Write a protein that binds this ligand. Structure first.
Ligand SMILES: *[C@@H]1O[C@H](CO)[C@@H](O[C@@H]2O[C@H](CO)[C@@H](O[C@@H]3O[C@H](CO[C@H]4O[C@H](CO)[C@@H](O)[C@H](O)[C@@H]4O)[C@@H](O)[C@H](O[C@H]4O[C@H](CO)[C@@H](O)[C@H](O)[C@@H]4O)[C@@H]3O)[C@H](O)[C@H]2NC(C)=O)[C@H](O)[C@H]1NC(C)=O
Ligand SMILES: *[C@@H]1O[C@H](CO)[C@@H](O[C@@H]2O[C@H](CO)[C@@H](O)[C@H](O)[C@H]2NC(C)=O)[C@H](O)[C@H]1NC(C)=O
Ligand SMILES: *[C@@H]1O[C@H](CO)[C@@H](O)[C@H](O)[C@H]1NC(C)=O
Ligand SMILES: O=C(O)[C@@H]1O[C@@H](O)[C@H](O)[C@@H](O)[C@@H]1O
Ligand SMILES: [Cl-]
Length: 595
């Protein structure tokens, strides 16, 4: 019997925050050509769909009393160039200098280091930007990963107070949290529980005052292939924190490593394709629906980060826990690197269209009501018009997902009954579907016979599977209703996007950049910050050899790899937005390129 999905667009229940807009990684690198492409792909998720890159070992990019910040400056400018913030873990030895946080002098030096860097980047980027940064403790302090740095229980607390007072010395507006570990039952996780105790009741290393600032609590809990299992473990740890530390009852909780499965470099086929994309959406829906949508408990859950900004390696380009799939093409002169957009990364573009208010929705099957702890579920949002640039919008994101298990011999009948759409001008809807058959670059890779060093043409073919199948904007039926009976595969993702015609056309594409890949090939990447509306069919690219349209199937992702048959790519480029009512926005400033 079919899955009934009902959405009521009149009933805008509560706020829907985009709490999931974070990725991260650990260098084994951070300024190679590979990482510049990668963070361009990450930064190109539309509508700031990924905003934070939680990065380990950032203070190994600082060398040594005075410090050389050159390499840090590099990585951070790279993030800034891609409209990305660092999840700034205060993690590193300053290339060998710090060795012992029970050595009182080192504690004082750490504080002065933190003040220096914080004040430096306040200088470089401005305080308003640096105040958005999640400064954090050293990663997983109970997982013994300090290298040649002695970090005892007491030293961790000294370390923390220096982090806190150091940031404060730069500005009180800067945010700090921790410990970023799992919080297992005591006697386990001594440094994690000890930090909370110290902040709640302990004494400041520098000031002697009782209590120490702690702006958020970060944990890590992973699913062991179960999606719901991440939420169950979070609840337990959050309840324990509430009862044991009453002053942290309202302290925001982050799960900044909320991955389906521990071990990023373990090859898993489900990490290659939509199986993973659909599960990441499921996890997020579960979190919104079964934790934040006015539950009796109401824990203060504020951030989920999928730690998947790693670069893949041979012979597992797709099978690793990464947003991109990397190919090091060693047989060109010179060797070059290409990345493809994995479905998981494209899925972050779908999640990005969700707006600021959740709508009422219910999934059922033969009358039995099913919450997000099932294979099929939904997240629906509504947008309140802000100016002439936008109108009302609904985004309805449905998933079919059996966690890490795919079922290719399976179809799932789904009837979507949308009702109560507030009436208005030129109401159109647009579908966007993703599954393994139609949208798996991994799939095409395998149809082509798994080329280890893909040719130009094989890359085009693979890149054809990156975007969702998109139906042209049809108009909305009378009465503000819409019924649809799509068949969904398992896994799959379906985004129904209902939008009203805004008064003005789209705003100007900005910050266009050209990036070389190899002979005859390049990447175009831009920012959608001033486009001012999410109702977008595609981005129209034009090339000039002393302007004509580059013909390509529609795509809202703010990155295009230009690879024409002719190899002709030297000249100038410009890009503009095209909306669901065919209206054009103003062309970006023209970008020049010469191979
Ligand atoms: C095209 O040319 C590039 C060079 O530009 C080659 O790139 C190398 O590819 C290999 C994989 O084939 C990479 O080596 C692998 O690195 C992994 C990560 O290494 C880090 O982490 C581990 C511990 O987790 C540390 O030991 C290590 O020092 C690093 O810090 C390792 O996990 C891999 O080990 C596994 O695979 C090898 C076999 O490949 C086994 O021997 C091991 O036992 C283990 O199972 C592996 O070492 C390497 O890093 C890449 N180098 C660069 C510079 O990118 C491409 O391989 C080449 N392409 C082709 C097709 O030849
Ligand atoms: C999510 O659903 C699963 C079932 O798929 C629940 O697990 C069951 O929990 C009950 C207790 O209510 C136990 O009696 C069963 O043994 C469990 N069954 C299985 C198959 O695991 C789970 O509790 C649900 N969790 C949430 C948060 O909704
Ligand atoms: C800082 O480090 C960079 C990279 O190692 C180096 O090129 C530069 O000369 C150094 N600058 C100073 C002032 O020491
Ligand atoms: O699951 C993994 O591979 C890892 O978990 C932790 O140990 C690390 O902090 C992450 O860098 C990584 O996501
Ligand atoms: Cl995973």
């Amino acid at each position: 019997a079919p899955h009934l999905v009902q959405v009521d667009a009149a009933r805008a229940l509560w706020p829907l925050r985009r709490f999931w807009r974070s990725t991260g990684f650990c260098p084994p690198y951070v300024l190679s050509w590979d990482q510049q492409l990668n963070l361009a792909y990450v930064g190109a998720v539309p509508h700031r769909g990924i905003k934070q890159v939680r990065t380990h070992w950032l203070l190994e990019l600082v060398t040594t009393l005075s410090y050389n910040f050159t390499h840090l400056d590099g990585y951070l400018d790279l993030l800034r160039e891609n409209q990305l913030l660092p999840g700034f873990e205060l993690m590193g030895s300053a290339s060998g200098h710090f060795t012992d946080f029970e050595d009182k002098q080192q504690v004082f030096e750490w504080k002065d280091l933190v003040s220096s860097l914080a004040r430096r980047y306040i200088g470089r980027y401005g305080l308003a930007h640096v105040s958005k940064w999640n400064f954090e403790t050293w990663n997983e302090p109970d997982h013994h990963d300090f290298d040649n740095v002695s970090m005892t229980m007491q030293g961790f607390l000294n370390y923390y107070d220096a982090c806190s007072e150091g940031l404060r010395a730069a500005s009180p507006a800067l945010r700090l949290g921790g410990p970023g570990d799992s919080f297992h039952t005591p006697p386990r996780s001594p440094l994690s529980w000890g930090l909370l105790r110290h902040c709640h009741d302990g004494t400041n290393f520098f000031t002697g005052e009782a209590g120490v600032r702690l702006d958020y609590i970060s944990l890590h809990r992973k699913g062991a292939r179960s999606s719901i299992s991440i939420l169950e473990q979070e609840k337990v740890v959050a309840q324990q924190i509430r009862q044991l530390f009453p002053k942290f009852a309202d302290t925001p909780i982050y799960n900044d490593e909320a991955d389906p499965l521990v071990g990023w470099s373990l090859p898993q086929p489900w990490r290659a394709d939509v199986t993973y994309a659909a599960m990441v959406v499921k996890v997020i829906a579960q979190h919104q629906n079964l934790l934040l949508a006015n539950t009796t408990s109401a824990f203060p859950y504020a951030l989920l980060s999928n730690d998947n900004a790693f670069l893949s390696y041979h012979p597992h380009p797709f099978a690793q826990r990464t947003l991109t799939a990397r190919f090091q093409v060693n047989n060109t002169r010179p060797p070059h690197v290409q990345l493809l957009r994995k479905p998981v990364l494209t899925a972050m573009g779908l999640l990005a269209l969700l707006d600021e208010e959740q709508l009422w929705a219910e999934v059922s099957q033969a009358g039995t009501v099913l919450d997000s702890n099932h294979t099929v579920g939904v997240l629906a949002s509504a947008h309140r018009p802000q100016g002439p640039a936008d109108a009302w919008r609904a985004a309805v994101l449905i998933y079919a997902s059996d966690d890490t298990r795919a079922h290719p011999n399976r179809s799932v009948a789904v009837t979507l009954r949308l009702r109560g759409v507030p009436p208005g001008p030129g109401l159109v809807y647009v579908t966007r579907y993703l599954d393994n058959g139609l949208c798996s670059p991994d799939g095409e890779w395998r149809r082509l016979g798994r080329p280890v060093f893909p040719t130009a043409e094989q890359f085009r073919r693979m890149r054809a599977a990156e975007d969702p199948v998109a139906a042209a904007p049809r108009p909305l039926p009378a009465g503000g209703r819409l019924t649809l009976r799509p068949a969904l595969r398992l896994p799959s993702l379906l985004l129904v996007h209902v939008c009203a015609r805004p008064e003005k056309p789209p705003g100007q594409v900005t910050r266009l950049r050209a990036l070389p890949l190899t002979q005859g090939q390049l990447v175009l990447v831009w920012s959608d910050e001033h486009v001012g509306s999410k109702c977008l069919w595609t981005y129209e690219i034009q090339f000039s050899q002393d302007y004509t349209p580059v013909s390509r199937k529609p795509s809202t992702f703010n990155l295009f790899v230009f690879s024409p048959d002719t190899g002709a790519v030297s000249g100038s480029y410009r890009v503009r937005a095209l909306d669901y009512w065919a209206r054009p926005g103003p062309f970006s400033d023209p970008v020049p390129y010469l191979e």
